[PDB]
């Protein structure tokens, strides 16, 4: 259950998760929304 | 104080490549023609569009440069073809010109793809190469193109549309025999195709009295000329240079008194 | 936007091959096979067709 | 002269000093359609 | 835009992966208008209740 | 009101009065040219015909000026105006048959910009009198200004996207005065520091120091073409240095075609040793150093910044102080169209390969590093103990920096070294290095061996945090890697810890130079 | 245009009096109407 | 329009002249000859010729700028033999060089019609 | 291993980030809280059991590539150059022509530069798929020699293929619109779109109004050069006394479209569009995504470039003092990784921290395509045809087109129009002024001893002018 030598593939996952969902401008909608 | 006997050896032949040795000859001459296939061999494209509608998507300009890149067969008729500029037409007629067509609409909902087959000629010796396709737009259901096209005849010192030829190889020496370049570390250099020596040598023993003969070419051809009257063509033009130099030479030095 | 008609530096005809390498691509071809079964050994010709981006197929979806 | 509406693309000819709609569609956004003078281009 | 002040235009150790190291422009301007790094994600706040 | 209609900058008594705005001047960008002479400069077709020149009428020139004047605003060495006697100013443009029009001795054609014309050329901040200087016409078919390189020293300029203006002087005591006060060949040498300010430069540098080494030889038809090329040849070909086996001429021959009139000079070069006017081979010198020019010719040496720059008593000083100010040009102009067209045969480049090192000298740069980083520890953790005595006006912290620091400066040198004595002789670096056209030695100890020692505010990295300098470590360590020693090398990378820190070091740097610039310039105006 | 041209070598500098600016300017009595154009 | 027609690098105008003698007076029996709309194609092959007559002193060329099309020749030789010999003898050697290799390859492109092996 | 195998399928199974926090495996952390926190950089190294740094690690980053902003993250390898050189890269890919939006046909923007053939790169970093680079790129891989060829490259200058050129090399377009309203400011005082007839209007000038049609707008198609009247529009004379829009000088475009509708208060205007196309010249300005940036020094043809063994020319060649002086070796593997993955075809990968992509990895790969291992070629003289006794170092990189070209940097004055108050020269819509003599300039002058140079410049060239003085008295008369 230990991710060794797989972390490099494993950390673009979790990286491509973050950007798919909050997106690069999450910044500006999510205080206007507000 | 005179020329020397050069002799040639073929070694493949295709429809699209010549390999061939020139032996017996100076470098100064063996470089003056590899310039020559590029340059100043002569060769038909299209060099005057005018567009009558156009509603895809490239603008105007975008499509009258995607046809001149094109290959016109120009295999024959070229020695046929005043310039232009010489004939004594007006700006265009039969005699130093070629005239093209295009006229396509697309009505169905799938689109549709503008290949080279739709460049329809009057003279039936120069087509596109076609006897795939190139690629010039695509279009959507409402839209249309429609065209006309003069085909000149120049060389590539106008413009690179005009050049007959792909990569040309050219090299000579294939170890350093004269040792022309110097390695820092002759062991890290991958063999020449064309060298002789063993698997376990690097370069040949320097001899100080040489001098670089034996050159080795590769002629490719993009589709207008065959790989064989590129060559020709070449020699036929460089020779008919230095032939009318010489008579402005002579002109010069009789007008002299 | 669209495939050019040559090669920049060579000048070997390229437009004519992107349906091909689609297709090819398309089966089980790697990049690296699919460019030697059309005949492209030049590193400058194959850089042609490696790095395209195709941006007339999304200039078509806007209604004339 | 002659417009071209910018919604269903149906040519109609404005007359000067008219208002600027479509027909058919009711419109406020007109393009002038292309001259018919011809211009000829380089392939260089 | 002028004061020649550094402390406010220099690099702070705090700015580690919130906002970008390296993008800045030069001029006058230098270190005043920065980036914010690639995961940096600002609050919008809540009630305390 | 009145006295608010004549207020300071931008009033009638500060902005209209000594600086104001002038016509007869064009602006554009600036690209190199090595074909031209020092004093001309290239002119676009399009900036040459709007710009004029009034020529006065005399019976010298008159049938000139009416050819000049039968063409007008059409062709492009033509005229745009005629001014007569009465002081009508007729235009060419509207004029409806041309012929009509006879000159006459007194009236005044207004000609086109043309060749051989004296303009005045600056950038964009002149600070000292040689930011402005008078250069001479030449056209050329494109759109950029086009200047030599040597000339760009003064300037101060480089091409990429700068940009020069130029200012036509009308008249012809104007025309006389920049022709004898400001041409750029007259001001060679400085009054600032009475050394030159145009020196050999960028890449002819470089391709000098190569072509005078000791064993350089070229062919017959390579010294016949290298020759093609000197402004200044009697028209003879030099005996070769080598006649037997087969005739070969060798650098130091052809370069004494180039230095002018019968000049006498002694310098040494970059690399010479101190240890070799000691013992015997004084004037034999193994490396071939001590470049010695006897009655105008090169016996030995090769040739760097040291000998061709912008030093005092150079090569160039020499020729100046001696043969005048016309030869110099020549002499410029020589040696950077002889240059290039041989370095289009030796070639030169930068590669990786020029960047690495072989096996033993990176296992010697671990080793040396490891004990390093060794020493470090024992210092850290003999001062735990207070067992540290301070010295006579140093508190206990800053004797234990001032030693941290000596440690690591050693291994930044010692290291710096063994990057030196492992190149070889084919090496790219060393040849921008030692020809001194390009970099210095710590360049090359950087890339290859370590990077160093980052610091802001002239100290070593701060506790940002609150006793840490990062969330990676823990409180209060003290070692090299926690505190900003860079242990890489620029062809290894580096680790994010060290990227960050090496960001904080150049922001500093970067931020001096946006200040300094205003500073100087608002000081030497009030000095002015 | 008929008188000569010729160079500054002083400049000197004062209040003037009511008597010359009385003498020198040009709307003899004097500007009394505030409005400046009728027709 | 700042730039020039591409037909400027090789179509000569009205009042040119190809070629232009002009003899060099710092050395007795130099030459020197200025082809106009030229470049380094025609200028190489001439110089490798003249360098192997056993009567030549000198022989070089120039382009003096690349922006221009123009080229400058130079030939020195003994005081028995003049520089328009030797040029116009130059010429006349490669075309009965170029002539004959065509001749040698237009032969062996038709010694493979079917094939030799 | 559970949430990674379960993560890799959020097609089709609805768990995505959010059910992520939910399960307390990721968290976000501000700056304060992040002073009683310690970090690690790397889990299958810093969490291993030996003498080791630490032992109470209570975090982990994911990867250490995410502390850098946007522009700074299409950097190949930008933990081998020196620090000052990612600033300017990263203020300079900022205007770099491209394609900027899909849908650039509709919009009537102003100053929109676009590219003709635009490719991604050969050698990527892992963080540009979220940034779409590769759907909108700005940029084209060229063949790029660092060596000294004629001594047009030196200084920061590049010398490129001219036959390139013509098949399509960096060529692109330039849009540009203009505005006209047509307004009522007074009750009488009115305009309207006509076209302007000579004896009946007055305020004209003389060039031609030929080109307009009957509503006073210019049909697309027509290629209107400079000085040409675009818009006309007349207004009422308390007869008719015309102005209009003309265009700037040296244009040379071509109408693209012209639109017509009311703007916000109501008042009918209109928008057109011109068309230019730009060639790259010898002074436009082109850009590495190293910092380096410098300008064209000169174009030479294909039978001039210098060739390799089987006819490959470089479409730039570069001055190699450029490289030791700011020392920029990322900008000397990405041409080494670029020549790898042409002959591959793969596409590289120069993830900043990556530790598994060394130069003895790259260059033991390149040995097996039959290349030297290094880079380095043979290539042969194109004048001449002789070999270059040292080896050239050549390979693809990925260059990019700046905004600054020359066609809108030159511009000159020789007795134009002035001012009318103070008579000082004058520029207005003529585009063309003067350049100002400055202060530092007029010292330059006075200590160079030039007095007639110095009072041409400032009296005989910027408003001369003459008066009366008196004699007895310092009055004008
Ligand atoms: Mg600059
Ligand atoms: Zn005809
Ligand atoms: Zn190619
Ligand atoms: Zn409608
Ligand atoms: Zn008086």
Not at chain 2, 137 to 145: F, H, W
Not at chain 5, 18 to 43: D, F, Q, R, W
Not at chain 6, 243 to 272: A, D, E, M, V, Y
Not at chain 8, 68 to 80: A, F
Request: hydrophobic share 35%; aromatic share 8%; charged share 25%.
């Amino acid at each position: 259950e230990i991710t060794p030598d797989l972390w490099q593939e494993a950390c673009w996952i979790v990286i491509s998760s973050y950007f798919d969902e909050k997106g690069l401008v999450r910044q500006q909608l999510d205080s206007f929304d507000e | 104080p005179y020329a020397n006997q050069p002799t040639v050896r073929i070694t493949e032949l295709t429809d699209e490549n010549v390999k061939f040795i020139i032996e017996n000859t100076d470098l100064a001459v063996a470089n003056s023609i590899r310039r020559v296939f590029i340059a100043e061999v002569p060769i038909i494209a299209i060099d005057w569009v005018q567009i009558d509608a156009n509603s895809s998507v490239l603008h105007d300009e975008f499509i009258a440069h995607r046809l001149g890149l094109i290959p016109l067969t120009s295999d024959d008729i070229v020695d046929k073809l005043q310039y232009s500029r010489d004939c004594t037409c007006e700006e265009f007629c039969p005699e130093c010109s070629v005239e093209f067509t295009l006229d396509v609409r697309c009505n169905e909902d799938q689109t549709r793809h503008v290949t080279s087959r739709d460049l329809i000629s009057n003279s039936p010796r120069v087509i596109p190469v076609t006897s795939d396709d190139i690629l010039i737009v695509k279009l959507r259901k409402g839209q249309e193109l429609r065209l006309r096209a003069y085909a000149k005849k120049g060389f590539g010192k106008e413009h690179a549309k005009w050049n007959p030829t792909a990569g040309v190889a050219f090299e000579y020496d294939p170890d350093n025999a004269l040792r022309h370049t110097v390695y820092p570390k002759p062991e890290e250099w991958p063999k020449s195709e064309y060298s002789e020596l063993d698997e376990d040598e690097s370069q040949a023993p320097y001899d100080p009295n040489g001098k670089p003969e034996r050159f080795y070419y590769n002629v490719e051809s993009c589709g207008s000329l065959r790989p064989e009257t590129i060559v020709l063509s070449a020699l036929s033009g460089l020779k008919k240079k230095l032939s009318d130099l010489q008579t402005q030479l002579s002109h010069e030095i009789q007008s002299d008194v | 936007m669209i495939i050019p008609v040559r090669c920049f530096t060579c000048g070997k005809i390229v437009g004519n091959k992107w349906e091909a390498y689609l297709g090819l691509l398309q089966a089980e071809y790697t990049e690296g096979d699919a460019l030697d079964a059309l005949g492209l050994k030049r590193y400058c010709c194959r850089r042609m067709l490696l790095a395209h981006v195709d941006l007339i197929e999304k200039l078509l979806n806007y209604a004339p | 002269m002659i417009y071209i509406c910018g919604e269903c693309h149906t040519e109609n000819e404005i007359k000067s000093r008219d208002p600027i709609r479509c027909r058919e569609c009711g419109y406020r956004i007109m393009y002038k359609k292309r001259t018919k003078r011809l211009v000829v281009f380089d392939a260089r | 835009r002028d004061g020649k002040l550094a402390k406010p235009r220099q690099l702070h150790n705090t700015l580690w992966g919130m906002v970008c190291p390296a993008e800045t422009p030069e001029g006058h301007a230098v270190g005043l208008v920065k980036n914010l790094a690639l995961m940096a994600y600002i609050s919008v706040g809540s009630q305390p209740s | 009101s009145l006295k608010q209609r004549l207020k300071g900058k931008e009033g009638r008594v500060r902005g209209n009065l000594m600086g104001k705005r002038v016509d007869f001047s064009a602006r554009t960008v600036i690209t190199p040219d090595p074909n031209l002479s020092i004093d001309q400069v290239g002119v676009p077709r399009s900036i040459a015909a709007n710009m004029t020149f009034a020529e006065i009428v005399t019976p010298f020139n008159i049938d000139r000026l009416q050819e000049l004047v039968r063409r007008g605003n059409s062709q492009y060495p033509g005229a745009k105006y005629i001014i007569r006697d009465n002081g009508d100013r007729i235009d060419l443009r509207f004029h409806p048959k041309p012929s009509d029009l006879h000159l006459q001795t007194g009236y005044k054609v207004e000609r086109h910009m043309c060749d051989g014309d004296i303009v005045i050329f600056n950038r964009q901040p002149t600070l000292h009198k040689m930011s402005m200087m008078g250069h001479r016409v030449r056209i050329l078919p494109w759109s950029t200004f086009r200047l030599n390189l040597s000339v760009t020293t003064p300037y101060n300029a480089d091409f990429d996207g700068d940009e020069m203006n130029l200012h036509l002087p009308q008249s012809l005591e104007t025309r006389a005065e920049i022709q004898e006060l400001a041409m750029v060949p007259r001001m060679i040498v400085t009054p600032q520091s009475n050394r030159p300010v145009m020196g050999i430069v960028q890449d002819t540098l470089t391709a000098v120091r190569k072509f005078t080494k000791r064993d350089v030889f070229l062919e017959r038809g390579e010294v016949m073409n290298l020759l093609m090329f000197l402004s200044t040849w009697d028209g003879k070909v030099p005996q070769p240095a080598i006649l037997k086996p087969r005739p070969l001429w060798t650098g130091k021959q052809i370069f004494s075609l180039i230095i002018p009139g019968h000049i006498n000079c002694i310098r040494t070069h970059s690399t010479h040793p101190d240890d070799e006017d000691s013992g015997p081979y004084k004037h034999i010198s193994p490396g071939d150093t001590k470049v010695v020019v006897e009655n105008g010719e090169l016996i030995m040496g090769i040739l760097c910044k040291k000998s061709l720059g912008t030093s005092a008593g150079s090569l160039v000083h020499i020729s100046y102080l001696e043969m005048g100010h016309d030869i110099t040009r020549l002499f410029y102009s020589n040696i950077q169209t002889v240059i290039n067209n041989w370095l289009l045969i030796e070639g030169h480049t930068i590669g990786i390969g020029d960047s690495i090192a072989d096996s033993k000298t990176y296992q010697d740069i671990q080793n040396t590093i490891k004990k390093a980083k060794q020493d470090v520890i024992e210092v850290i953790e003999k001062a735990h103990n207070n067992e540290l005595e301070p010295t006579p006006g140093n508190t206990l912290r800053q004797t234990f920096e001032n030693q941290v620091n000596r440690i690591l400066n050693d291994a930044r040198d010692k290291t710096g070294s063994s990057a030196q004595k492992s190149l070889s002789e084919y090496n790219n670096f060393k040849s921008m290095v030692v020809s001194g056209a390009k970099g210095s030695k710590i360049n090359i100890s950087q890339v290859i061996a370590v990077v160093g020692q980052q610091n802001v505010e002239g100290k070593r990295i701060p506790f940002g945090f609150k006793h840490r300098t990062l969330p990676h470590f823990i409180k209060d360590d003290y070692g090299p890697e926690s505190r900003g020693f860079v242990e890489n090398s620029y062809l290894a990378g580096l680790t994010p810890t060290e990227f960050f820190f090496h960001a904080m070091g150049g922001r500093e740097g970067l931020i001096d130079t946006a200040v300094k610039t205003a500073e100087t310039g608002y000081i030497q105006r009030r000095l002015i | 245009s008929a008188c000569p041209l010729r160079t500054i070598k002083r400049v000197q500098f004062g209040v003037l009096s009511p008597d010359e600016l009385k003498r020198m300017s040009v709307t003899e009595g004097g500007i009394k109407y505030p409005e400046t154009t009728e027709g | 329009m700042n730039a020039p027609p591409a037909f400027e690098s090789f179509l000569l105008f009205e009042g040119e002249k190809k070629i232009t003698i002009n003899k060099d007076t710092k050395v007795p029996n130099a030459c020197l000859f200025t082809i106009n709309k030229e470049d380094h194609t025609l200028g190489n092959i001439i110089k490798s010729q003249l360098l192997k007559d056993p009567q030549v002193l000198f022989a070089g060329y120039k382009v003096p700028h690349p922006l221009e099309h123009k080229i400058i020749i130079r030939v020195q030789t003994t005081p028995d033999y003049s520089p328009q010999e030797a040029f116009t003898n130059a010429i006349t050697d490669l075309i009965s060089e170029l002539s004959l290799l065509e001749e040698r390859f237009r032969v062996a492109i038709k010694d493979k019609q079917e094939g030799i092996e | 291993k559970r949430h990674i195998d379960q993560l890799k399928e959020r097609e089709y199974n609805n768990y995505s980030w959010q059910d992520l926090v939910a399960s307390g495996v990721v968290e976000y952390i501000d700056t304060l809280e992040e002073e009683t926190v310690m970090l690690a950089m790397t889990p299958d190294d810093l969490q291993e059991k030996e003498v080791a740094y630490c032992s109470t690690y209570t975090h982990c980053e994911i990867h250490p590539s995410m502390i850098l902003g946007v522009c700074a993250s299409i950097i190949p390898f930008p933990d081998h150059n020196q620090s000052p050189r990612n600033t300017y890269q990263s203020a300079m890919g900022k205007q770099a022509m491209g394609v900027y939006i899909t849908n650039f046909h509709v919009r009537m923007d102003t100053l929109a530069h676009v590219l003709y053939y635009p490719q991604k790169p050969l050698v990527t970093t892992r963080s540009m798929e979220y940034l779409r680079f590769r759907e909108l790129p700005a940029g084209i891989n060229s063949i790029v020699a660092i060596a000294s060829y004629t001594g047009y490259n030196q200084e920061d200058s590049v010398i490129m293929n001219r036959s390139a050129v013509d098949r399509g090399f960096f060529r692109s377009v330039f849009y540009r619109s203009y505005k006209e309203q047509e307004s009522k400011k007074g009750f009488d005082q009115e305009e309207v779109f006509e076209k302007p007839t000579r004896e009946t209007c007055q305020g004209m000038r003389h060039a031609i109004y030929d080109k307009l049609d009957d509503d006073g707008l210019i049909a697309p198609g027509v290629r209107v050069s400079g000085d040409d009247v675009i818009i006309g529009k007349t207004v009422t004379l308390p007869t008719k006394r015309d102005c209009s829009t003309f265009l700037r000088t040296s244009e040379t475009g071509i109408v693209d479209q012209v639109m017509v509708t009311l703007n916000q208060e109501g008042y009918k205007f209109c928008k057109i569009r011109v068309r230019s196309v730009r060639i790259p010249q010898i002074g436009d300005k082109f850009a590495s995504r190293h910092g380096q940036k410098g300008t064209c020094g000169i174009q030479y043809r294909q039978e001039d470039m210098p060739f390799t063994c089987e006819g490959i020319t470089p479409d730039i060649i570069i001055n190699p003092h450029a490289i030791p002086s700011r020392m920029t070796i990322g900008h000397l593997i990405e041409c080494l990784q670029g020549k790898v993955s042409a002959n591959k075809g793969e596409i590289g990968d120069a993830t900043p921290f990556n530790d598994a992509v060394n130069v003895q990895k790259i260059s033991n790969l390149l040995s097996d395509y039959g290349y030297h291992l290094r880079g380095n070629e043979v290539l042969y003289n194109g004048f001449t045809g002789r070999k270059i006794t040292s080896q050239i170092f050549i390979g693809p990189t990925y260059y990019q087109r700046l905004k600054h070209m020359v066609d809108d940097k030159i511009h000159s004055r020789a007795r134009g129009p002035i001012q009318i108050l103070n008579r000082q020269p004058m520029e207005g819509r003529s585009r063309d002024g003067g350049l100002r003599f400055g202060e530092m300039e007029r010292d330059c002058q006075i200590a160079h001893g030039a007095a007639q140079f110095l009072r041409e410049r400032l009296f005989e060239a910027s408003d001369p002018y003459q008066v009366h003085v008196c004699n007895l008295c310092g009055i004008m008369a």
